[PDB]
Design a protein around this nucleic acid. Structure first.
Ligand SMILES: [Cl-]
Ligand SMILES: [Cl-]
Ligand SMILES: [Cl-]
Ligand SMILES: [Cl-]
Ligand SMILES: [Cl-]
Ligand SMILES: [Cl-]
Ligand SMILES: [Cl-]
Ligand SMILES: [K+]
Ligand SMILES: [Mg+2]
Ligand SMILES: [Mg+2]
Ligand SMILES: [Mg+2]
Ligand SMILES: [Mg+2]
Ligand SMILES: [Mg+2]
Ligand SMILES: [Mg+2]
Ligand SMILES: [Mg+2]
Ligand SMILES: [Mg+2]
Ligand SMILES: [Mg+2]
Ligand SMILES: [Mg+2]
Ligand SMILES: [Mg+2]
Ligand SMILES: [Mg+2]
Ligand SMILES: [Mg+2]
Ligand SMILES: [Mg+2]
Ligand SMILES: [Mg+2]
Ligand SMILES: [Mg+2]
Ligand SMILES: [Mg+2]
Ligand SMILES: [Mg+2]
Ligand SMILES: [Mg+2]
Ligand SMILES: [Mg+2]
Ligand SMILES: [Mg+2]
Ligand SMILES: [Mg+2]
Ligand SMILES: [Mg+2]
Ligand SMILES: [Mg+2]
Ligand SMILES: [Mg+2]
Ligand code: NA
Ligand code: NA
Ligand code: NA
Ligand code: NA
Ligand code: NA
Ligand code: NA
Ligand code: NA
Ligand code: NA
Ligand code: NA
Ligand code: NA
Ligand code: NA
Ligand code: NA
Ligand code: NA
Ligand code: NA
Ligand code: NA
Ligand code: NA
Ligand code: NA
Ligand code: NA
Ligand code: NA
Ligand code: NA
Ligand code: NA
Lengths: 160, 172, 142, 132, 337
RNA sequence: AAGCCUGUGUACCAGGAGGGGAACAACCCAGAGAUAGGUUAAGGUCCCCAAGUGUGGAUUAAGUGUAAUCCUCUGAAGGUGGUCUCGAGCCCUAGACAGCCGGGAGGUGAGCUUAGAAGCAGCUACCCUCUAAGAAAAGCGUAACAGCUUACCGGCCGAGGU
RNA sequence: CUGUCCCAACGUUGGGCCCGGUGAACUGUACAUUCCAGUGCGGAGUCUGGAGACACCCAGGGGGAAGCGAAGACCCUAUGGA
RNA sequence: CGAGUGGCUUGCUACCUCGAUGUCGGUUCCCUCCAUCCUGCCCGUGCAGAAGCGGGCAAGGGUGAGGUUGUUCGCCUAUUAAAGGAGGUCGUGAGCUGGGUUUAGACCGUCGUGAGACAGGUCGGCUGCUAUCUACUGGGUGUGUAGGUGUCUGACAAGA
RNA sequence: CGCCACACGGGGUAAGAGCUGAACGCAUCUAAGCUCGAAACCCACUUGGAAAAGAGACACCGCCGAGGUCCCGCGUACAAG
């Protein structure tokens, strides 16, 4: 199913699990990556991937983008490189599909998506000055898998 | 901007409209230098290329006009010469100058002679397996040389195996 | 064969549309106009796109027909017709009191209308009407 | 192919039944296709003297029957024109079975052959008893 | 899926209407190469026979062997270039400037023209020479007419008039050449322009067939099988799709067929002679007996017997000329039988 | 999703002229007795077509564009040393950036591993001389050498460069 | 077995075409020489923009007039019928 | 995983027509689109050659004949340079055909107490009209240019 | 169903191959310029075409007579015309 079907925020918030059953599990494997035993403050460089447009990102997209980003960090810094990446959003919004025609149209439950407002941090990675260009590359690959245009922003980091 | 090119003692350069002619002991070359708001003129002993605009596109042509003129200075004095070597593996390639065009026979065993016409007052001299393309107009000479190499072009088969042809050996 | 033109316009190095616009206005005011040196008239832009537009007009047509001129003669004449209500009495009279010529069949040199002249020293992206006709397949009779 | 040296009005079509002028054991042949031929909408693919055609065996020995082989048209009832203007026509329509190299599959040829076929298929000719 | 198929007939010979002139009009002429000379000639179609020839083609396996060839006999008596017309180059193409006429006229030219009684050849000539000095002189052509009276088999005496271009060396030389021919009496023959073995382009108005249907006129199919018995036999399926809501001129329809001008290219001139060598026993059916200047054209020629046909040196030959072919035999066998 | 279905508030069409919008129920101006003069609104002032080929300045080279709104006027993620403008850091006449010329040296072919490995298979170390430079060698190359260049220093050049 | 087909041709008879005589019907809101696009209740000769277009008449095969012919026999609706 | 283009399929909607815009498939005849099957010109190759594979430009021309099936589609055969796809009221019934869907007769299976039914199968089962306008193919008569004969020019138009 | 005839070549381009060449001292097929390069485009060739409203040109004949129509005998033409 194309994202065109779910990317917009044209529907009421639909997250109350006490009134919604049969919700598919999330495909997102992890939210905390790298060295989760270490603190973010232990790093000189902090780069975030910022969403430029308000949208809904299906859990399948979060996984694909997160995967393609962390997979790169692993390939360039090693399975235990000195870095830590975070996917701060969780797919709370439940999605439907009307899969009879328009009669009794209320859709059956098909998935979940995360609502992200423009200007927000979807991903935030923490690394050393050396690995700064590696995290910028992970993010480049990550924004190619989500609907909106993004900004790769260096927050804590002035070895520039 | 403005750039001044002091013409060599050996040379004398005349100019009318958008055309510039450069004459030397080795010949004469006339060229059209036409571009928006770029004035080329002969101020006694120097050629002047100037313009009231300084945008990227204008600067590009100004620098281009300079080298064009400088190349003309060199062409009417020292001249331009391209060196070429005719190489073949199985079939003896016959390269001859006939009229105003260089002809190549028996290329890769071909019955039909490959040929190309020489540009301008360009001279092609052959001494065995060596060729020398020369003249005062770098444009004409450069093309004549290139055309000769392009004349033995092969697309049908693997060039790494079928390397026959005339190639540019020395470039001025 | 003789045309008592009250005004003789020289189109050499002039922007066809700007000339046409003025020639249309004058013809509607009662003036008999003669456009001279049409082959040397000019239109600004990228030659490749300009040519495509005119080639398309040649190709267009059917049984009812779409006769589009190839010679710089007609191109200019047609350009003027588009600035006149040629189907109305007043429009047709004005149009018929206007004639375009290849070169200058008159003794007098034409006058250059204000704001129509193109400076070749300041422009490189433009085309000659004659060049367009040659590309269209016209017989260079000028 | 090489010029026949004669103009031919194809007298056969896809589906025609013709005589197998050899001793291969095949008596009757059914035309299926004509080598190198391309027709036009609704046109029955045509074959005539000198053409190499694909064929199936309709009559003959059990082993030869139903086989799909190649053959060469040796004789045809419809006339053909020779350079001198004269027309030449045969008593029947006949073809000789041939292999990949255009060599007759059989040992002997039955009945006459047209001289024009000889030009194109040498080994077929050098097996002919009569050449008219 | 509805197999593809080329459309019925060519769209390049239209509109398929009755020709305006029964006398053909070449719309193209040969290029200027050799010496100055008239670029065409005319004759009257007589009929057909065959000839045995010696294979001329150097690339033919049959080179030197006997070969039967179809031939159309055309009576080609001498014609008369009665005037020299001059064209001037103008911004609107070529326009006739003036003409230089003669005094010697065929006894029956007045059956078609209002023959000149008073004319100033030199004034016209002067005007042409001044035009040439100015460099405004376009090509040069000769007003020519036939002498049907010389051809007994043709009922007409009224001459056929046509203009033929003169191509040659310099314009000055060919201008002089033109004037010379005209001044004499304009009398010229097939020999003067053509040589047996050369290729010529023959123009002519085809045999008329009046109104004919799409099957004959355009080559469309006849209704097939069961369809052929329903009430429709030689009518096309439809005049077009729903849209466009109009009948396109490209759909094959009924109309005038035949009596059109055609210019058949590359016709080999087998022989140019005089006498009765080519005449058939009993006479050419619907024509008569040939005994005079003739031309044997290879193959067929557009038009019916008696019609005026035009010759012109091939403007786009494929093969090189193989002059004076050896004619070993010309059939005189009756065409009746 | 719909020129979709179904609410709600409001104005309009329906039942609303006239001006504009190419045409066009509901978009803009505008609510209108007749007649007459005048001034504006929306919108527009190169011609078609009433009014500017108006003024100061800048951008665009694609005919982009000359398309408020819209079933109607598309154009996206992604990309761009196309071009214009503005800012920050660093280097530079003690000569920067680039290019061209010259030098790119010895202990020593480091030790180990290995038949061999000598900058460059792998492991480890990565030391000091001459000097204005020159790695226990950044990239090709060899069976291994050779060979070719990067770093590094000098010259030529001369103005911004990154 | 053969023109059903390849692939169509020629011919025969009656029409067709022209002339004398006889002499209807269907159909008709108006206007109407249209074509390409657009627009419009979304399938326009007639609106908009262009293009083309001198008038009348003869023959033709039927592309369009969502052609003529029949208050849809499908479907639904009616507090209809049989 | 993300962004799109098309409007050939299917679905959705119920805007248009129920005082009717004649169905499917086929046929015949015309025009077109390009997302190119062949052909031309090219680039790359895991390009020696030969034979290929993939890609670019490109719509000029070509893309055919048969066996089963009403079939569209599709399966299969032999040929072929290749035997491309799609739009034109799913082009084309005032052109044809009428094999299928879908009238009235009948049989079988299933369902039903039954009349009778079936998004099951099967045999049989009709194709109206003299063209007013417009459109085009061809043929005339007039008028305009403003007496005649003959010969030409070439704005444009068509072609594969 | 038989027979005859139906190019080549130019010009300008696409994709592409290159030349000279700067912005950016180098490099660079491109930004200005240029050499090439498709069955495609233009020309060539065939057909139509003075109603092209800028409604054409030339020569001769003629305006009391040139020419044309009707008529008659016929077809290389044709449904009327
Ligand atoms: Cl047209
Ligand atoms: Cl108007
Ligand atoms: Cl410019
Ligand atoms: Cl076949
Ligand atoms: Cl049929
Ligand atoms: Cl009110
Ligand atoms: Cl434009
Ligand atoms: K209905
Ligand atoms: Mg190969
Ligand atoms: Mg068929
Ligand atoms: Mg019937
Ligand atoms: Mg006979
Ligand atoms: Mg006989
Ligand atoms: Mg109401
Ligand atoms: Mg005004
Ligand atoms: Mg645009
Ligand atoms: Mg908008
Ligand atoms: Mg209109
Ligand atoms: Mg009803
Ligand atoms: Mg019912
Ligand atoms: Mg009841
Ligand atoms: Mg209908
Ligand atoms: Mg394409
Ligand atoms: Mg086409
Ligand atoms: Mg249909
Ligand atoms: Mg179709
Ligand atoms: Mg119909
Ligand atoms: Mg019907
Ligand atoms: Mg009917
Ligand atoms: Mg049926
Ligand atoms: Mg049945
Ligand atoms: Mg049935
Ligand atoms: Mg009038
Ligand atoms: Na339901
Ligand atoms: Na994105
Ligand atoms: Na312009
Ligand atoms: Na046109
Ligand atoms: Na019937
Ligand atoms: Na019948
Ligand atoms: Na219909
Ligand atoms: Na109201
Ligand atoms: Na309006
Ligand atoms: Na535009
Ligand atoms: Na029959
Ligand atoms: Na109709
Ligand atoms: Na109705
Ligand atoms: Na059908
Ligand atoms: Na094509
Ligand atoms: Na089938
Ligand atoms: Na329909
Ligand atoms: Na049908
Ligand atoms: Na019917
Ligand atoms: Na070309
Ligand atoms: Na006229």
């Amino acid at each position: 199913k194309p994202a065109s079907m779910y990317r917009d925020i044209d529907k009421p918030a639909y997250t109350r699990r006490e009134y919604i059953t049969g919700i598919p599990g999330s495909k997102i494997a992890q939210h905390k990556m790298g060295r989760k035993q270490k603190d973010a403050d232990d790093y000189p460089v902090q780069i975030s991937l910022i969403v430029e447009e308000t949208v809904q990102l299906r859990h399948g997209s979060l996984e694909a983008s997160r995967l393609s980003a962390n997979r790169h960090l692993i390939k360039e810094l090693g399975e235990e490189g000195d870095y830590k990446m975070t996917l701060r959003k969780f797919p709370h919004q439940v999605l439907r599909e009307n899969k009879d025609g328009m009669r009794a149209a209320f859709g059956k439950i098909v998935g979940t998506a995360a609502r992200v407002q423009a200007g927000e941090q979807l991903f935030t990675a923490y690394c050393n000055v050396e690995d700064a260009e590696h995290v910028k590359e992970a993010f480049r690959r990550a924004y190619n898998k989500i609907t909106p245009s993004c900004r790769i922003k260096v927050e804590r980091g002035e070895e520039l | 901007p403005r750039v001044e090119l002091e013409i060599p003692e050996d040379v004398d350069a005349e100019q009318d409209h958008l055309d510039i002619t450069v004459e030397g002991d080795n010949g004469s070359v006339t060229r059209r230098l036409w571009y928006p708001d770029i004035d080329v003129s002969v101020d006694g002993d120097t050629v002047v290329i100037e313009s009231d605009e300084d945008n990227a596109k204008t600067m590009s042509t100004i620098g281009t006009f300079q080298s064009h003129i400088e190349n003309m200075f060199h062409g009417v004095t020292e001249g331009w010469e391209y060196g070429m070597e005719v190489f073949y593996s199985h079939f003896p390639m016959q390269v001859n100058v006939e009229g105003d065009e260089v002809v190549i026979e028996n290329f890769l065993g071909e019955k039909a002679p490959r040929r190309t016409t020489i540009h301008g007052d360009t001279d092609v001299e052959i001494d065995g397996e060596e060729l020398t393309v020369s003249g005062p107009d770098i444009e004409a000479v450069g093309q004549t040389a290139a055309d000769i190499e392009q004349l033995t072009r092969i697309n049908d088969k693997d060039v790494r195996v079928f390397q026959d042809g005339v190639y540019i050996t020395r470039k001025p | 064969a003789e045309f008592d033109a009250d005004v003789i316009v020289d189109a050499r190095d002039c922007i066809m549309g700007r000339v046409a616009s003025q020639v249309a206005e004058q013809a509607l005011d009662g003036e008999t106009v003669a456009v001279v040196n049409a082959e040397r008239a000019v239109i600004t832009g990228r030659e490749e796109q300009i040519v495509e537009k005119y080639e398309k007009r040649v190709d267009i047509g059917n049984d009812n027909g779409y006769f589009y001129p190839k010679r710089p003669d007609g191109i200019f004449k047609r350009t003027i017709r588009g600035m006149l209500p040629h189907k109305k009495q007043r429009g047709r009279e004005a149009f018929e009191s206007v004639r375009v010529y290849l070169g200058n069949p008159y003794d007098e040199d034409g006058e250059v209308l204000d704001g129509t002249s193109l400076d070749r020293l300041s422009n490189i992206k433009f085309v000659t009407l004659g060049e367009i006709s040659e590309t269209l397949g016209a017989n260079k009779t000028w | 192919m090489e010029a026949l040296g004669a103009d031919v009005t194809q007298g056969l079509e896809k589906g025609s039944l013709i005589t197998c002028a050899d001793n291969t054991g095949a008596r009757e042949l059914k035309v299926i296709s004509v080598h190198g031929y391309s027709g036009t909408k609704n046109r029955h693919p045509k074959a005539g003297l000198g053409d190499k055609i694909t064929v199936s065996v309709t009559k003959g020995t059990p082993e030869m029957r139903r086989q799909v082989l190649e053959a060469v048209v040796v004789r045809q009832r419809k006339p053909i024109r020779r350079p001198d203007g004269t027309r030449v026509k045969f008593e029947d329509n006949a073809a000789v079975i041939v292999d990949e190299n255009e060599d007759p599959r059989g040992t002997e040829l039955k009945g006459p052959i047209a001289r024009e076929v000889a030009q194109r298929f040498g080994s077929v000719a050098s097996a002919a008893t009569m050449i008219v | 899926p509805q197999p593809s198929r080329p459309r019925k007939g060519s769209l390049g010979f239209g509109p398929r209407k009755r020709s305006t002139s029964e006398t053909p009009r070449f719309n193209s002429w040969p290029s200027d190469d050799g010496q100055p000379g008239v670029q065409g000639f005319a004759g009257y179609k007589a009929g057909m026979t065959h000839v045995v020839l010696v294979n001329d083609e150097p690339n033919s396996p049959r080179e030197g062997m006997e070969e039967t060839v179809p031939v159309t006999v055309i009576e080609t008596p001498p014609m008369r270039a009665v005037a020299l017309r001059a064209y001037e180059d103008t911004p609107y193409g070529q326009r006739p400037l003036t003409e230089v006429w003669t005094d010697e006229f065929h006894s029956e030219l007045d059956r078609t023209l209002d023959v000149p009684e008073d004319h100033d050849p030199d004034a016209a000539e002067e005007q042409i020479r001044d035009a040439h000095e100015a460099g405004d002189l376009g090509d040069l052509r000769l007003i020519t007419h036939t002498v049907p009276d010389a051809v007994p088999s043709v009922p007409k005496k009224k001459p056929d008039v046509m203009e033929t271009r003169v191509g040659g060396g310099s314009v000055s030389d060919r201008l002089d050449h033109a004037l010379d021919i005209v001044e004499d009496g304009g009398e010229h023959a097939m020999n003067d322009i053509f040589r047996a073995g050369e290729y010529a382009d023959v123009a002519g108005v085809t045999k008329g067939k009046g109104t004919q249907g799409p099957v004959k006129r355009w080559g469309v199919q006849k209704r097939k099988g069961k369809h052929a018995r329903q009430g429709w036999r030689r009518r096309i399926g439809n005049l077009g799709p729903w849209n466009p809501s109009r009948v396109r001129s490209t759909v094959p329809q009924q109309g005038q067929t035949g009596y059109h001008q055609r210019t058949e290219l590359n016709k080999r001139l087998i022989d140019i002679g005089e006498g009765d060598e080519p005449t058939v026993d009993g006479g050419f059916v619907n024509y008569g007996e040939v005994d005079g200047p003739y031309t044997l054209v290879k193959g067929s020629v557009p038009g019916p017997d008696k019609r005026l046909v035009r010759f012109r040196p091939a403007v786009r030959p494929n093969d090189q000329p193989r002059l004076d072919p050896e004619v070993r035999y010309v059939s005189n066998e009756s065409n009746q039988g």
